[PDB]
């Protein structure tokens, strides 16, 4: 019977009014809540012609609950090429990015899976909306994900600290539930897919060496790789390492689409002590050529992502 | 797997950016939502010194989420005598006043509970808030109720229309249910304590024996009273009759405090083809004189609620 | 997180092993939560052939449900023509009469409905086994109503004693939270359709008004009537009162089917020290000759249905 | 709002009536299943003595809803000292050997976690009844875990088959939801701790690259490693790999334990269809001697087990 309930929706405001603007970053948080938990729900009655659908169902219910916070200028899905424009009697200042769903059909394993999303703020001018504004890096005003695993956290970054929200099941809200998450700078674990790509690797092919087969006296740092985007962020910026998906021989390298994948990613790191690097420039600070445009990652643990810094300049 | 997701809390917005003003509104009846799921929750696993506690603990509640959606001046509860001024750097335009718990301990017959709110638009300036804001009947802007039963409908009645909203306990949303409710204007049902009162009716006794003994060849009105304030009036708005609590000898008659019970549920009538009269006058056009005071209430369909005053005054 | 949790089931199956038996009790029991459950939540978001669904849908649920436990073998229902004979492969020794939603269509004012259920043995050697396995009178082994309001509430009574268990919903289960339950002498409120009753009710007049006003003098009677069989027979299973529906036109007088209205009510009244009757007859000890025999009903604490009755003495 | 609704429960009661038992088995499971579906909402919320809690209460739990269920008689613990014997009131001819929260305490980072069991039956005549009872090796007579995931899955598997039921929490029960599932002859993922294991992989490094870049010409495998026994286990079950933890020093390699990591892990994985070794020796003949015995495992897909057996002949 628990009386100081700390939602997401009025702890955002809580920081926002101590601030003037206009709500809607709120309005949009907080419409972007719903969908999530929709999505949640539908995934934990998982599987109760056939090919993909829930994702798909749900990028749909992304994008109509994100476009009725009055708060959205236009959208950029992972499942739709071409931002979608919002509409006029329904826009306000923002530009969001989404993959509503990193893992939507490997789910079969129980495995973890999540809505990544992005958001910008229109601002340049009469132009009036339409997809250019998807245009910078590390200006993302707020940034964050979902991962339903055992639980359904919705980790938000924003401006100036990193917090993790929890969804509890009984009332319908994320609860605060770590105020300002900094990453564990080193000590760690790694993550790769070592099969796929280890005859394939680079530089970075001595970099899992040396933290394999430790040059020296150290004892080595573990494997740990889920093969999901989300489910391997987080435990990176909880229990601390490094997480790195290059791909190497074709080279905006990796399948993650930069700009509503690890950019995001690379923000909600950043502001917890995280280098999100693509190993030669800073992941943040990259203009987006196009929208749908896969690059890679190297994110975590900053003595660790700058030692492979260190790998790769001497070196390539 | 169900993607219009029509949640009271766009709902409204949606009414509402078609009109400017200031977002307020929807941040005070989302977070009115909020607690409203919490109590029907610890309601729901109910009863798993001793003498009240648990709605006196959601009085807690509904406070300071109340004082948190940053759009309230002043509070009054049941619960307290005096309103409780919202704080200086927390105010925001808005006056409401509410009986978090009708029925709190009358649990135990699982029976239907409520929180009805009324809320009022502070605006009349630097007096700076204080306890006068609590000074009209027919101004309220928005008012409602949430009736716990065998669901958990908040009915939002405002300014143009009556609407009603579903818990759906899987997602944590209030759902478009019905979209503009109006009142079975006669064929009916009628409520009232025949025991407590019988004797003591006034006026209105022989108004029951005609609804009793049929002044004719019609069939009779039946007996429905569940002795909960929220219960009684929803069977009212839904399959249409007339409640009626006087309570004769001491007459600002009955227990129901005008301001935050009587007072909203008057407009949520009012505004669907219903009359809510003292008997002598109309429940809404009454100033307080104090804000707790208790004062009766004969409400319903047009045609009955207009019988009892052709009951009334050619008689008394 | 306690772990002694005491469910239904572990309180059936402490009581199936004293008395030596074959685990019939138990499974019966365990199927009909089933029902009782997936039902709860029908109900908790109803509104989100087509005349009627929902009871018939109700309906199938509890016997599909019923069958499936091998512990059946006769089962009548309020809906379907004449009892249901089960499969000599799904058989097994217990009768069930059951009404699946009693005020079915009485919940969008959403107030508290349920689903009745009486259990019988079945004595005789075959037959092979049909309808006359009901003749019984209070034969009954186990009653109880499964209640539907804003708790679901399973009230199960056998040959020791009332028990009262509450689904928790946090995980699934009818826990025990209330013990042998006796009501109490005398302490009311009266319940009864105070309309059309009034315009028929001949002993019951005289006890009307003599609750009314009272002739020893002092303190008088509340009236209370939800109107719905479930809920006007729980209220007073926990407060103290009385309730009649004897109604006079439909004359064997009642709705109120003998078999799985009245009876099992009359049996849980009984075991709680309350009585139930006729006004002539008790109700359990009338013998059946019709499955779907109406039968008239008042029930309820002791001293005030004894007080009706020493009225219907000197009367009609 | 299908009504063959098909829980667990029945699928478990048909089958014991197959067989011609006494029901203990649907008792035990039916016990089981109320603990999975706490544990599985305490998870869902964690995060909202004191350096290690939750493990406990899971282990205090299953003990106690396994005592209450007359149906079995020792209970071999990860947590406990040695046996618990059950008093000889709530005895029961099972076994139940079972690891209450599997990977417990690195659940912040999300991931799937999950109670493992396997129930023998006790022959011998009295001794009473103590930990003597394990020794058998593949004499289960059911094994499974439940995986607590963004579904609770429960897997469970027996003398006939695998079955995957799921629990859907409108509800509260373990469905029905595939069928018989045999795992598919090779097919591949390679799941093993890559960093450690590879400073002390033997025959394992062979397969690994022989895995990695491959000899017969084509196609790489993708490596996946969770973390946690269970996930990696089901994961396994349903797309095809090869899951190892062979380890070296801590030399009775494994932390998994024999009786109730490791030997029900086996059994599903044989019962659907693939195998698991010690490399050396076959997982489930393996005598005991320590309740406790720490046991090497390597299991999965038929091909890709006998491969790395192929390999174990000629090597280390």
Redesign the interface.
Same mark, same amino acid.
């Given at each position: 019977?628990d009386?100081?309930?700390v939602?997401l929706?009025?702890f955002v *405001?809580?920081q926002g009014? +101590?601030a003037r603007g206009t709500?809607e970053m709120?309005?949009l948080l907080?419409?972007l809540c719903?969908?999530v938990?929709?999505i949640?729900? #539908?995934? =934990?009655?998982?599987?109760?012609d056939q090919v993909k659908?829930?994702d798909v169902?749900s990028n749909?219910?992304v994008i109509? /609950?994100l476009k009725?916070? $009055?708060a959205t200028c236009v959208l950029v899905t992972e499942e739709d090429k071409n931002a979608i424009i919002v509409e006029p009697?329904k826009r306000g200042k923002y530009v969001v990015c989404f993959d509503p769903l990193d893992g939507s059909s490997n789910?079969?394993?129980? /495995?973890? !899976?999540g809505t990544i999303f992005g958001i910008y703020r229109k601002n340049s001018t009469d132009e009036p909306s339409e997809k250019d504004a998807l245009q910078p890096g590390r200006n993302l005003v707020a940034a964050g994900y979902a991962?339903?695993?055992? #639980?359904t *956290?919705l980790v938000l970054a924003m401006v100036n600290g990193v917090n993790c929200f *929890?969804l509890?099941?009984? !009332?319908?809200?994320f609860?605060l /539930?770590?105020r300002n998450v900094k990453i564990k700078k080193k000590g760690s674990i790694?993550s790769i897919?070592? %099969?796929?790509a +280890?005859?394939f690797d680079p530089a970075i092919t001595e970099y899992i060496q040396r +933290? +394999? $087969?430790?040059p020296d006296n150290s #004892?080595?740092?573990?494997?740990?790789?889920? %093969?999901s985007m989300v489910?391997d962020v987080? =435990?990176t910026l /909880?229990?601390g390492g490094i997480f790195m998906y290059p791909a190497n021989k074709k080279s905006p390298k990796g399948k993650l689409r930069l700009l509503y994948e690890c950019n995001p990613m690379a923000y909600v790191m950043e502001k917890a002590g995280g280098l999100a690097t693509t190993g030669k420039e800073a992941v943040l600070d990259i203009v987006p050529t196009d929208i749908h445009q896969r690059a890679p990652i190297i994110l975590g643990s900053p003595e660790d992502v700058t030692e492979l810094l260190e790998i790769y300049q001497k070196h390539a």
């Open positions: 019977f009386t100081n309930i939602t929706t009025r *405001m809580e009014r +101590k709500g709120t309005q907080n419409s719903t969908a938990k929709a949640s729900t #539908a995934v =934990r009655k998982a599987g109760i659908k829930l169902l749909d219910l109509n /609950v009725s916070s $009055f009697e789910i079969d394993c129980l /495995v973890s !899976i991962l339903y695993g055992s #639980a *956290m *929890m509890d099941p009984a !009332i319908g809200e609860i /539930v770590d790694y897919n070592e %099969g796929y +280890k005859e +933290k +394999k $087969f430790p #004892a080595p740092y573990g494997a740990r790789y889920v %093969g489910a987080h =435990r /909880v229990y």
